[PDB]
Design a protein around this ligand. Structure first.
Ligand SMILES: [K+]
Ligand SMILES: [K+]
Ligand SMILES: [K+]
Ligand SMILES: [Mg+2]
Ligand SMILES: [Mg+2]
Ligand SMILES: [Mg+2]
Ligand SMILES: [Mg+2]
Ligand SMILES: [Mg+2]
Ligand SMILES: [Mg+2]
Ligand SMILES: [Mg+2]
Ligand SMILES: [Mg+2]
Ligand SMILES: [Mg+2]
Ligand SMILES: [Mg+2]
Ligand SMILES: [Mg+2]
Ligand SMILES: [Mg+2]
Ligand SMILES: [Mg+2]
Ligand SMILES: [Mg+2]
Ligand SMILES: [Mg+2]
Ligand SMILES: [Mg+2]
Ligand SMILES: [Mg+2]
Ligand SMILES: [Mg+2]
Ligand SMILES: [Mg+2]
Ligand SMILES: [Mg+2]
Ligand SMILES: [Mg+2]
Ligand SMILES: [Mg+2]
Ligand SMILES: [Mg+2]
Ligand SMILES: [Mg+2]
Ligand SMILES: [Mg+2]
Ligand SMILES: [Mg+2]
Lengths: 102, 319, 120, 74, 158, 341
RNA sequence: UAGGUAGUAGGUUUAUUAAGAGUUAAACCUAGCCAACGAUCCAUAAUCGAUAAUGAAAGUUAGAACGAUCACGUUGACUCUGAAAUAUAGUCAAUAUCUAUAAGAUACAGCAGUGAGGAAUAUUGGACAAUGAUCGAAAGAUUGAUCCAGUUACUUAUUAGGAUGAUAUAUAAAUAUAUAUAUAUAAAUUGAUUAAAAAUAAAAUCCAUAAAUAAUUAAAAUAAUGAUAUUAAUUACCAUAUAUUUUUAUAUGGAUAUAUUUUAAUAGUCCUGACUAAUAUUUGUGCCAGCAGUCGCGGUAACACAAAGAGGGC
C-alpha cells in the first residue's frame, strides 16, 4: 500500500526491528535502515533476501499493524510449562519432587 | 483354419525371376514399382493415373477391381499404358470395358470394398453467399432456406457462421495466394451441390431414433380397427414423430420457434464489488437436498473410467 | 466461532484443487464428517477472464450456490457462522455490517458495483 | 525330474519342482515357493522361484528369462 | 454401484433434511380432523374394544398429538424487546442489530413453512380431483362403442 | 499413445488414416478382407486387425475398450413411406467406431487439415489448433455439435502441399532442367517445322484436362496457325549450372536461373521461408483420399470447419468413413462387445 | 451339539432409575418358557451403503480406499465427576519396562521411526498460507487435526515426432512455356532364387514442439498473512497505439547486429502343435536335457524341448 511516516518511538527500521523482537534485530543488514524497503518489500522479495519463513511472515504482520496505527510491541510465542507439556508432566513432576524435595 | 498371409496383390503382376544376388528385392516392392511406374528426375510419378488431382469436379478414386491393377496412363492423353515384355509401357492389347461405363454411385465411392461410404457435395461459392444474404439481410428463417435449397438446418447454420469468418479474413487481407490456390484446387475435386437436382438434395425428414421405441411391441386389435401414427405414439408414450421433426427444426439460431425463457426463474445475487477486490462473488439460489457435494460418493480416480474434462481455457482438468 | 451449531466450510475436491461445502455442523464433529445439513457450495478459484474481456472490463467471478431461505433459518435459531462463511453471507446480503470485525471493516473503501439481485 | 522337499515359514512341508536346466539348490538353501503342480510327478504341487533367495537364475537362459530369474544381457 | 440406480444414479448421500416445524400446526385442519375421527374396531381396528381390560399400569388410549400454534411459537421463541432500551453503546448497538435480524429470519421461516404445508395440502387435493376426473373421462372413452367393435364376435345373451 | 512402428508395411498390407504413398498401394492391392475358411474367433480377430489399423491405431487396446460404446446411433427418415422407391437397409454396424469421430485429431483428418491422424495429433499438441477461439492442445478433446475448430493456415498448406525440396536437391533438378531445355532449343532450331508440327498435334489430345492448351491459345495470340521462323530464332539457350560454384550460395543460384517457367528461383524454393513447396502445389496422390465428410462443413479459404453432428447411419449409407465393408465391421463389433472373449 | 432352561416362563409387591421390564436386589406365589422351519452348545467374524469388483440379470464377493455405525486404546473389575463414562480419568490387581526407590512413572491401536513377524505396504519431511478445533475481551497463542511435499509403476490418466524416404556418379546446343528425359558405369547388408522375405525398415531430406534460456506471471486470500514454490500458465527482444469471435495485422517508443535465444527423440515383456492371434525357414538335442493351464511333446525330417531367422499379442 502506501508508505507510513516514521514516528518518535519508531524513528528508523532498526528501532522497528527491535520493538517487534523475536530476534528480528538480526535482519538490520538485510533492510539497510531503508524505511521504504521495509514498507515495499513483500514476501517474494524477502524470501529472495534470505529471510526465513517465520520471520518474513512476522515482519509483514507488524508492517501491516504499523500502517494501521496498531501496536507493534513484541508478542512472545508460547512456551511449555516449567514442569513440561501436559502429556509428560506427571512423569516429570514425579521425578522433580523426588530430586529436589525428596 | 487361418495362417499368416503376405498381402500380395489380388491382381496379376510380373513376379520376380532369377535375381542377381545383391538386389535383395521383394515381390511386394516390385509390385509397387509397377503400380507407381517410373520415377522421373523430379521425384514424380507422372505415369500413375492418381498422381495428379482432378480439375473437373469428378473425384478420381481408385478402381483397382475395374482396371485389374492397371494404374498407368499417358500423362497428357490419359490413354491406358501397360507393361510389356520389353520392359516398356505401351497401349493395351484389348480395351477395358469395365472402365468406360462406370455407375454414377461408384464415381463418388472412394473405397472399393465399402459402397456405403460416399463423398459429400461441395457447395458453390455463390450458393453460400445467397444463403448468407438471405438469413442475415433478408431475414429468412433457417427452416425456409433449408426447405428451399434442400440442405439440413445444421449445415445452413454452419454456412452462415463460416461465411462470416471469410468476410473478416477478406476484410483484413488474411487470405493469401496459397490459401486461394489450395481452396480452388480442392473445390475442383468434389461434385458441386445442385439444389435443383432432386437426388443431390439432402433428406429433411430424419429424426433421432430413440431407445425405448427400438423394441418391437405388437398389439392384437379388431380386424377393422384403425391404428395410426398418433395411436402408436400413445402406446409408446412418446410425442408423435411429426412433432419431434418440427421441434428439431426450431433449434437453429436463425430458425423459427427458437425460444429460451422458461429458465429465467433462478434468483441470483452479484456481491458488492469494492475498489481493490480482484474477484466478484455470484450467489445462485439452491435447495437443500440437491445442492452440495455428496458424502461417500464413488471415487473413480483410480479406475479406468475416471472423469476428465476441459475448463474455459482448454486445460485438461479432472472432474 | 462459538456454540454447538456452526456454519462452516467442509473441504472436498482433490489436492491443489479445493472445493467446499457450506454446511451446518456440530462443533465437535470432524471437518469432513457428514453434517446436519449442506447449505451450499463454494468454489474458491475465480473463473479466468480472457485478455479481451479484461480490457473490456470483466471481473473474475467466484461462484457460490446457496439455499438462501434455509441459511436464514439456521441464523435465526442461533447457528454461528465461521469467519470465512461470515464474509460470504455479508457479500450475499444475508448478514449485515453488524457481523463485521475491526480487522476487515471496510468503513472507507469505494464501492465500484452495488449488490444486484437478479433472476437467471 | 529335479524336485526338493521344503519346510515353509508356516510349518507346512511341501514338495516343489525346480524348473529350468541346472540348479544350485542344496539342503538349508532359502527358497521361495509358488503355486503350480508338476503334472507327471504326483504329489509335487508347487514350484520354486528361480532367481529368488538362494536359488539362482537359469544359467545362459535367453528366452522367457522372466520365468527363470535371468537378467537381461547388456 | 447398482444401488445408485434406485436414487437417480446419485452417488453418495446427503444428511436427512430437518423439519422446521417438528409437529403439525393448528392450521392443518385436515390432520386435526383425522386424529379426532373415531378409531376403527374389529379386524382392521385400532385400540381396546369396549369391555376389554387394558394392561394394568398402561394408558388405554394413545397420547394426544401436540399441535403447534405458530403464533405462540413465535411469541415464546423470538419475543420482541419489551422496552426500547437505550443502546448508546457500540456493543449494544451491534447486539440490537443482530437480535433484530435473527428475529426477522426465524419469524419468516416459521410462517413460510406453515404456508408451504397448507399450500401443499391444497395442491394435492386439487391434483387428486383432477386425476380422478381424468380417469373417469379416459374410462368413458374406453367404454365408448366404436365401429370396429362390430367385428368382435359376441355371445351377450349366453 | 502407441508407438508408430511398421505402419506402412506392404507384407501386412494394413490401411491407415493417411495419404502416404505406401498406404495407397496397400489400399489399392487389398481387394477386401478374406473371411472364408476361418472359425468365428479367426474371423473376429481378422476384422479387429484391419479395422483397428485404420480406426484409431494410435490408441492402446485397453483405452479403446473403455472408449468403445455398445450403443450405435441411427436416424429414421419419416418420408420413406411417402416416396415409393425401394428402401435400402441401414448399415447400423458401420457405426462401431463412430465414437472416435468426435475426437479433435480425427476431426482434423476428416476436414483434410492434416495428412494423417498422427499428424493431426502433432498439430494439436504443438499449439496450432483452436476450438471456438480457444487453443486446445489435447488430441483427445471431444467436439460437440456446432463447435468450430481452426488450424493455422501454414500447417494445413504444409500437410496438403508437396514437400519442400532442399537447396542441394532442388539445385540438381535445375541442372537437368537446363540440359533438357537446351535440347528443345537445338531440335527447334535444327528442324523448326517438325517441332512446331509436333507441338500442334500435342495440343489436339489435351482433352481439357490439361489447361496448358488454354494458355497456349494465348501464346498463339501473342505472336491461321501457320509456322513462323521467328519462333525458332527467338528461342535462346540457357547457361549451364556449375553445382560446385553456386553451392551454399542460394541468392547467387537464384540469379543464374531464368527459365520460361521457372524464373529467378530454384525448383520448389520460390519462397524458402515458407514451410512447403513453392509455388504451392497439391501433395502427390491426393485424389484417392480426398473425401468430403458429411458431418463437417469445411471452409478451406480460412481453414475453418464446424462439427455439424456425430456421424450417423441412414438407409444405404453410413457417415463413418471406412475402407471396410459392413461384414468386417460386424465382426469387429462382435469382438469388442465381449472384450475379445 | 438334541434336548435346553431354574430368575429359568408368568403373576403380585417393594427398592432402585427421569423412565417400562426378573434390568438389579429382596419377599411371596403359579409351572411354565425354548426346541428338527434347528433350541442349547461350539467354532468363526467388527457391520453396512447412493462404496468397490463382477455378471445380461437375479445375484455373488470384498468391507483397503470415501462415508455411516459399533467396539477398543497393555489386561480385569470397581468408583468419582457429569445430562451422558465401568472414561485413553481415578482406585486396586495383573503383565512388561524404567529411575527418582516412591502406597513412583511408563504402556506409540496420535505422527514420524525402530526391532520382530511376513510374499508384502512409505519420511524420525515442511507449514499453520488454506479449512477447521481449543484458549483469550482483544492483540494473539497452540494444533503430527489439517494442508502440502518425500518414498513406492500399487491403481488411473496424459504425453513419450510428424511429413518425405529404396542407390550413387558421369552424362546431353555452343526465351510462343519445355516435359513420359534418355543413356551408360559402379555399387548393392541377412536370408532366400520367387509369390521369401527382413524392408519405408535404416540413413538422408523437410518442418516442428518439449526442455533449456530470457522476460513475464496468475490463482489458491486477503485488511494482511502462500507452506506448497526454483508455482501454474503465457510470451519469444520488451513496451505502446490503432485496427483486429478468436485471432490477425500495421505502426510505433525503447532494445541488439537489414534482420533479431536455442533446440531434441534407443521399450520392454510373453508367445507362434490344438484350444488360441502368429506359413519363410534353419540349427542343436535324441523318452536325454527339458516343456506343460488342458490334450500332450521328446526314441535322429521336434511347427511343442534349447536357440537363429521370420511372425502374433499387450
Ligand atoms: K444350531
Ligand atoms: K491454521
Ligand atoms: K514384440
Ligand atoms: Mg492360429
Ligand atoms: Mg434373565
Ligand atoms: Mg418389577
Ligand atoms: Mg428374587
Ligand atoms: Mg476377530
Ligand atoms: Mg455382503
Ligand atoms: Mg462379510
Ligand atoms: Mg485404513
Ligand atoms: Mg474404553
Ligand atoms: Mg479396558
Ligand atoms: Mg484407566
Ligand atoms: Mg501398544
Ligand atoms: Mg505409528
Ligand atoms: Mg522378515
Ligand atoms: Mg504395496
Ligand atoms: Mg525406509
Ligand atoms: Mg509439526
Ligand atoms: Mg547371403
Ligand atoms: Mg518452454
Ligand atoms: Mg494465519
Ligand atoms: Mg501474495
Ligand atoms: Mg517355455
Ligand atoms: Mg532336429
Ligand atoms: Mg506351445
Ligand atoms: Mg520352442
Ligand atoms: Mg529372434
Amino acid at each position: 500500500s502506501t508508505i507510513p511516516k516514521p514516528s518518535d518511538q519508531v524513528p528508523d527500521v532498526d528501532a522497528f526491528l527491535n520493538k517487534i523482537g523475536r530476534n528480528c534485530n538480526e535482519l538490520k543488514d538485510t533492510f539497510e535502515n531503508n524505511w521504504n524497503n521495509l514498507f515495499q518489500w513483500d514476501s517474494k522479495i524477502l524470501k529472495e533476501k534470505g529471510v526465513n519463513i517465520q520471520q518474513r511472515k512476522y515482519i509483514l504482520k507488524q508492517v501491516h499493524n504499523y500502517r494501521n496505527n496498531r501496536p507493534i510491541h513484541e508478542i512472545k510465542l508460547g512456551k511449555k510449562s516449567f514442569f513440561g507439556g501436559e502429556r509428560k508432566r506427571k512423569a516429570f513432576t514425579a521425578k522433580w519432587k523426588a530430586e529436589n524435595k525428596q | 483354419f487361418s495362417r499368416r498371409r503376405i498381402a500380395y496383390p489380388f491382381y496379376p503382376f510380373k513376379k520376380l525371376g532369377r535375381q542377381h544376388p545383391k538386389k535383395h528385392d521383394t515381390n511386394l516392392k516390385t509390385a509397387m514399382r509397377q503400380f507407381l511406374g517410373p520415377k522421373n528426375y523430379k521425384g514424380e510419378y507422372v505415369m500413375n493415373k492418381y498422381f495428379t488431382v482432378p480439375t473437373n469436379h469428378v473425384p478420381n478414386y481408385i478402381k483397382p477391381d475395374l482396371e485389374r491393377g492397371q494404374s498407368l496412363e499417358h500423362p497428357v492423353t490419359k490413354k491406358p499404358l501397360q507393361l510389356r515384355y520389353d520392359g516398356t509401357l505401351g497401349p493395351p492389347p484389348v480395351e477395358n470395358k469395365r472402365l468406360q461405363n462406370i455407375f454414377k454411385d461408384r464415381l463418388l465411392q472412394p473405397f472399393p470394398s465399402n459402397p456405403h461410404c460416399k463423398t459429400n457435395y461441395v457447395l458453390s461459392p455463390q450458393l453460400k453467399q445467397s444463403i448468407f444474404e438471405e438469413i442475415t439481410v433478408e431475414g429468412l428463417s433457417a427452416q425456409q432456406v433449408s426447405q428451399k435449397y434442400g440442405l439440413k438446418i445444421p449445415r445452413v447454420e454452419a454456412i452462415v457462421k463460416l461465411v462470416s469468418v471469410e468476410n473478416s479474413w477478406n476484410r483484413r487481407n488474411r487470405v493469401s495466394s496459397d490459401l486461394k490456390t489450395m481452396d480452388e484446387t480442392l473445390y475442383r475435386m468434389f461434385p458441386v451441390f445442385d439444389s435443383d437436382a432432386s437426388f443431390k438434395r439432402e433428406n429433411l425428414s430424419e429424426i433421432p431414433v430413440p431407445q425405448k421405441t427400438l423394441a418391437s411391441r405388437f398389439l392384437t386389435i379388431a380386424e377393422s380397427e384403425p391404428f395410426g401414427p398418433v395411436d402408436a405414439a400413445h402406446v409408446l408414450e412418446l410425442e408423435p414423430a411429426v412433432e419431434t421433426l418440427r421441434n428439431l427444426s426450431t433449434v437453429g439460431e436463425h430458425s423459427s420457434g427458437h425460444q429460451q425463457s422458461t429458465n429465467k426463474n433462478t434468483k441470483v445475487i452479484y456481491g458488492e464489488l469494492v475498489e481493490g477486490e480482484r474477484s466478484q462473488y455470484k450467489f445462485t439460489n439452491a435447495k437443500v437436498g440437491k445442492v452440495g457435494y455428496r458424502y461417500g460418493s464413488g471415487n473413480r480416480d483410480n479406475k479406468k473410467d475416471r472423469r476428465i474434462g476441459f475448463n474455459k481455457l482448454g486445460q485438461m482438468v479432472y472432474i | 466461532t462459538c456454540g454447538l451449531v456452526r456454519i462452516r466450510l467442509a473441504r472436498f475436491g482433490r489436492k491443489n484443487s479445493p472445493v467446499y461445502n457450506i454446511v451446518v455442523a456440530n462443533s465437535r464433529k470432524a471437518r469432513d464428517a457428514k453434517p446436519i445439513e449442506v447449505l451450499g457450495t463454494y468454489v474458491p478459484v475465480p473463473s479466468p477472464v480472457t485478455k479481451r474481456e479484461l480490457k473490456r472490463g470483466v471481473v473474475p467471478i467466484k461462484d457460490v450456490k446457496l439455499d438462501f431461505d434455509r441459511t436464514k433459518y439456521w441464523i435465526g435459531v442461533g447457528a454461528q457462522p465461521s469467519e470465512t462463511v461470515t464474509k460470504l453471507l455479508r457479500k450475499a446480503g444475508i448478514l449485515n455490517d453488524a457481523w463485521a470485525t475491526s480487522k476487515n471493516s471496510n468503513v472507507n473503501r469505494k464501492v465500484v458495483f452495488e449488490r444486484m439481485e437478479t433472476l437467471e | 525330474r529335479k524336485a526338493c522337499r521344503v519346510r515353509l515359514t508356516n510349518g507346512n512341508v511341501v514338495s516343489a519342482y525346480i524348473p529350468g536346466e541346472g540348479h544350485d539348490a542344496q539342503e538349508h538353501s532359502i527358497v521361495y515357493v509358488r503355486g503350480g503342480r508338476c503334472q507327471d510327478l504326483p504329489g509335487v504341487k508347487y514350484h520354486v522361484i528361480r532367481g529368488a533367495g538362494d536359488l539362482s537364475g537359469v544359467v545362459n537362459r535367453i528366452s522367457s528369462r522372466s520365468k527363470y530369474g535371468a537378467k537381461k544381457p547388456s | 454401484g447398482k444401488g445408485a440406480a434406485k436414487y437417480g444414479f446419485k452417488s453418495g448421500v446427503f444428511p436427512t433434511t430437518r423439519s422446521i416445524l417438528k409437529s403439525p400446526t393448528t392450521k392443518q385442519t385436515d390432520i386435526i380432523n383425522k386424529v379426532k375421527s373415531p378409531k376403527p374396531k374389529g379386524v382392521l381396528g385400532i385400540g381396546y374394544a369396549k369391555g376389554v381390560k387394558h394392561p394394568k399400569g398402561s394408558h388405554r388410549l394413545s397420547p394426544k398429538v401436540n399441535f403447534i400454534d405458530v403464533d405462540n411459537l413465535i411469541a415464546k421463541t423470538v419475543a420482541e424487546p419489551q422496552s426500547i432500551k437505550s443502546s448508546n453503546g457500540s456493543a449494544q448497538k451491534v447486539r440490537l442489530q443482530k437480535a433484530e435480524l435473527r428475529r426477522k429470519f426465524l419469524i419468516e421461516a416459521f410462517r413460510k413453512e406453515e404456508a408451504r404445508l397448507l399450500h401443499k395440502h391444497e395442491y394435492l387435493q386439487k391434483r387428486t380431483k383432477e386425476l380422478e376426473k381424468a380417469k373417469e373421462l379416459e374410462l368413458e372413452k374406453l367404454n365408448k362403442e366404436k365401429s370396429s367393435d362390430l367385428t368382435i364376435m359376441t355371445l351377450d345373451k349366453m | 499413445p502407441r508407438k508408430a512402428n511398421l505402419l506402412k508395411s506392404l507384407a501386412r498390407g494394413r490401411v491407415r488414416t493417411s495419404f502416404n504413398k505406401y498406404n495407397l498401394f496397400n489400399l489399392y492391392k487389398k481387394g477386401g478382407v478374406d473371411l472364408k475358411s476361418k472359425s468365428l474367433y479367426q474371423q473376429k480377430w481378422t476384422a479387429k486387425q484391419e479395422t483397428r489399423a485404420y480406426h484409431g491405431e494410435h490408441l492402446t487396446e485397453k483405452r479403446w475398450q473403455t472408449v468403445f460404446k455398445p450403443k450405435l446411433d441411427s436416424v429414421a427418415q419419416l418420408d420413406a413411406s411417402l416416396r415409393g422407391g425401394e428402401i435400402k437397409e441401414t448399415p447400423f454396424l458401420l457405426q462401431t467406431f463412430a465414437v472416435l469421430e468426435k475426437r479433435l485429431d480425427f476431426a482434423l483428418f476428416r476436414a483434410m487439415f492434416a495428412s494423417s491422424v498422427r499428424q493431426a495429433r502433432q498439430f494439436i499438441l504443438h499449439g496450432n489448433v483452436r476450438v471456438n477461439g480457444v487453443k486446445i492442445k489435447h488430441p483427445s478433446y471431444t467436439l460437440k455439435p456446432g463447435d468450430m475448430f481452426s488450424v493455422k493456415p501454414d500447417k494445413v498448406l504444409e500437410a496438403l502441399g508437396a514437400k519442400k525440396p532442399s537447396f542441394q536437391e532442388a539445385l540438381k533438378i535445375d541442372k537437368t532442367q537446363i540440359v533438357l531445355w537446351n535440347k528443345y532449343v537445338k531440335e527447334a532450331k535444327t528442324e523448326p517445322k517438325e517441332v512446331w508440327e509436333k507441338k500442334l498435334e500435342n495440343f489436339e489430345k489435351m482433352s481439357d484436362s490439361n489447361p496448358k492448351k488454354l494458355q497456349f491459345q494465348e501464346f498463339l495470340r501473342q505472336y491461321s496457325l501457320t509456322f513462323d521462323p521467328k519462333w525458332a530464332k527467338n528461342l535462346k539457350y540457357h547457361d549451364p549450372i556449375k553445382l560446385s560454384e553456386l553451392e551454399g550460395d542460394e541468392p547467387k543460384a537464384r540469379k543464374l536461373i531464368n527459365l520460361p517457367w521457372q524464373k529467378n528461383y530454384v525448383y520448389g524454393r520460390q519462397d524458402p521461408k515458407k514451410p512447403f513447396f513453392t509455388p504451392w502445389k497439391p501433395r502427390p496422390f491426393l485424389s484417392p483420399f480426398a473425401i468430403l465428410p458429411h458431418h463437417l462443413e469445411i471452409s478451406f479459404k480460412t481453414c475453418h470447419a464446424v462439427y455439424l453432428r456425430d456421424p450417423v447411419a441412414r438407409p444405404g449409407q453410413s457417415e463413418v468413413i471406412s475402407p471396410f465393408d459392413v461384414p468386417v465391421h460386424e465382426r469387429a463389433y462382435m469382438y469388442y462387445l465381449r472384450n475379445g472373449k
